[PDB]
């Protein structure tokens, strides 16, 4: 559920 | 000998503006990726024999939608292939929300590690927050006119005058042409999804497209023009390693 395509 | 020259070259203008170099780093190695992977592309059809054979992957990438522009009361703000909405506002940040709209995701971009983002709830919202919702909350109320897998936003985009440019945080490209002939490179410059002004998509190996002289069934599409655009789209936007 994290976005990819950039840093938490 | 041909007797043909360069095209002009891309003036570009209304870019989003952003601080983080090393974000321009990535975009600029990333680039350059799906460009060499089109390059690659380009030199299978040339001279390669039964180019066809071993099957390439098959999966419709993400696109925008509908999308807008706005200098004051409001950021440029846009909709995904996933009923998402999106907010650039004017000073970089971004606001995203999701398709079950629950919740929303937002992004801001660092010098470090370049983007970064984090979860809230719209009841668990926080305060400062809310004030940047009441600028979603509008664009909501426009784009709402209308006449699960890791998440996706819009990291940089580019006005020139034959088309606009989309850099999408899933490594994906897209471009809405003059002739509202629409298209999307992903899958590191090896798949392609056009999408004709009648809003229809359907995605194709670019080994197989190149064979073929032109666009799959639309003849007045003029492909083999457009794909010189996105090349030295891209070639622009490689070389922006920095601010200066």
């Not at chain 2, 010098?111 to 979603?136: F, T």
């Not at chain 2, 699960?148 to 088309?163: A, G, M, S």
Request: with cysteine; glycine share 6%; charged share 25%.
């Amino acid at each position: 559920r994290s976005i990819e395509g950039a840093v938490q | 000998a041909q007797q043909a020259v360069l095209r002009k070259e891309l003036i570009a203008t209304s870019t989003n503006v952003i601080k983080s170099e090393i974000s321009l780093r990535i975009l600029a190695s990333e680039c350059h990726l799906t460009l060499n992977g089109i390059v690659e592309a380009e030199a299978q059809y040339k001279m390669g024999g039964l180019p066809k054979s071993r099957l390439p992957k098959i999966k419709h990438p993400m696109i925008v939608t509908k999308w807008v522009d706005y200098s004051n009361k409001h950021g440029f703000s846009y909709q995904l292939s996933t009923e998402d909405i999106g907010v650039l506002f004017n000073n970089g940040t971004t606001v995203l929300r999701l398709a079950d709209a629950e919740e929303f995701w937002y992004i801001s971009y660092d010098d470090r590690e370049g983007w970064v983002a984090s979860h809230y709830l719209l009841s668990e919202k926080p305060r400062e927050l809310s004030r940047h919702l009441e600028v979603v909350d509008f664009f909501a109320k426009y784009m709402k006119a209308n006449l699960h897998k890791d998440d996706v936003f819009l990291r940089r985009y580019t006005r020139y005058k034959p088309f606009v440019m989309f850099e999408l945080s899933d490594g994906t490209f897209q471009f809405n042409f003059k002739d509202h002939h629409k298209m999307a490179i992903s899958d590191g410059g090896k798949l392609v999804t056009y999408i004709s002004p009648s809003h229809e998509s359907t995605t194709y190996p670019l080994v197989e497209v190149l064979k073929y002289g032109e666009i799959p069934g639309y003849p007045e599409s003029n492909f083999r023009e457009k794909l010189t655009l996105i090349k030295e789209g891209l070639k622009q936007k490689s070389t922006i390693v920095t601010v200066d």
